[PDB]
């Protein structure tokens, strides 16, 4: 965890903790979702978020919960560092079959089935290994941009 990433989680903690007392309760979760447009947010969704913690969601409990789910989270500059080492001549997005062979043949984390799941929402270019960069974006901030 770099310090600017921890400051981003402190700003997200303050936007969900609308009572500003330092502990995100279930009313803060529901009023942050209602301010984003969720008028139908069920109480069972709020209870499942609180069921991931053993205590009240203060800043260090929110940081430890996000730490334990993001144990391989990598910032965009280090993902582009590794992709610039995979394309060491610069500019070009690397081939689809080169990333499939190098993921498998180096590591068990790069096994195929997982490579079909990589191509599956990370579209073609991304999946193929040709573009580059959009995948670093969606690994640090999810969903389609």
């Amino acid at each position: 965890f770099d310090e600017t990433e921890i400051e981003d989680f402190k700003e997200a903690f303050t936007v969900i903790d609308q009572n500003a007392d330092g502990i995100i309760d279930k009313d803060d979760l529901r009023e942050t979702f209602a301010a984003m447009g969720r008028l139908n947010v069920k109480n069972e969704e709020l209870d499942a978020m609180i069921k991931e913690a053993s205590g009240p969601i203060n800043f260090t409990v929110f940081l430890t919960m996000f730490g334990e789910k993001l144990k391989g989270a990598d910032p965009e500059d280090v993902i582009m560092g590794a992709f610039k080492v995979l394309d060491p001549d610069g500019k070009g997005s690397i081939k689809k079959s080169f990333l499939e062979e190098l993921l498998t043949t180096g590591g068990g984390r790069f096994t195929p089935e997982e490579i079909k799941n990589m191509w599956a929402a990370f579209p073609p270019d991304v999946a193929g290994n040709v573009d580059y960069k959009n995948i670093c974006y969606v690994i640090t901030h999810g969903e389609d941009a």
Partner: protein, 98 residues
């Protein structure tokens, strides 16, 4: 340029303006001996290369060691997270920030 390769007697031939000149069956014999002599010379020079070739692969494999992991773990996160309320929230919200 072609004759560059082969474990052949680079003697036995000779070039000129319209064509190459080549021995048989003596000069033919010569070359042959020669041929064997390069496998030696060659075969040995190949090896080191081969050897050496992979020796650089290890230096790369090794370097790579972690950059992968980084990549490895890093992805996994996301696959887990991207479905998490809190994380989607942070997501829609991440922009309003400065």
């Amino acid at each position: 340029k072609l004759l560059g390769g082969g474990d052949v007697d680079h003697t036995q031939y000779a070039f000129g303006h319209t064509k190459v000149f080549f021995k048989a069956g003596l000069l033919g014999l010569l070359e042959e001996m020669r041929d064997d002599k390069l496998a030696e010379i060659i075969t040995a020079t190949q090896a080191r290369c081969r050897g050496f070739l992979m020796r650089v692969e290890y230096r790369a494999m090794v370097e790579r060691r972690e950059s992968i992991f980084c990549i490895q773990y890093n992805v996994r996160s996301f696959m887990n997270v991207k479905h998490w309320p809190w994380m989607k929230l942070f997501f829609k919200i991440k922009p309003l920030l400065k």
